[PDB]
Design a protein around this ligand. Structure first.
Ligand SMILES: Cc1[nH]c(-c2csc(N3CCNCC3)n2)c2c1C(=O)CCC2
Ligand SMILES: Cc1[nH]c(-c2csc(N3CCNCC3)n2)c2c1C(=O)CCC2
Length: 102
């Protein structure tokens, strides 16, 4: 049942206003320099697919994939960019609610 809270928090993240940059994997054909800079891309739908498949053995693995989405976001996007400003909203939301369970 370590993962039943992950379904809640991923469902809440999937439907958050500011989740639009992270619903689908970043298409590197459209973003100059992404493949070069971001070694391990991650997004909500890949997390949904791994969760759907049972690929998260512990609750901390799910959080590692989640923090990676935002570490990527800060690595590539300026803090005042549209994607950056949304990644900060999502990152505080995730951390604020991850602590509300743990
Ligand atoms: C994490 C991330 N999301 C986006 C982005 C821009 S537009 C858009 N969408 C989502 C897909 N269909 C509609 C509009 N998603 C970027 C990004 C980066 O890290 C680099 C800059 C571009
Ligand atoms: C998965 C994904 N879909 C799109 C997308 C569809 S339409 C459109 N534009 C951007 C330029 N002005 C016209 C409309 N962008 C992107 C994307 C990414 O991964 C990165 C950002 C771009």
């Amino acid at each position: 049942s370590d993962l039943t809270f992950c379904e809640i928090i991923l469902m809440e993240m999937e439907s958050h206003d500011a989740a639009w940059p992270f619903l689908e994997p970043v298409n590197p054909r459209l973003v100059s320099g992404y493949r070069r800079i971001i070694k391990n891309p991650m997004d909500f739908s890949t997390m949904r697919h791994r969760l759907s498949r049972g690929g998260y053995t512990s609750s901390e693995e799910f959080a590692a994939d989640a923090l990676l989405v935002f570490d990527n976001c800060q690595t590539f996007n300026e803090d005042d960019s549209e994607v950056g400003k949304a990644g900060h909203i999502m990152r505080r939301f995730f951390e604020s609610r991850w602590e509300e369970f743990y």
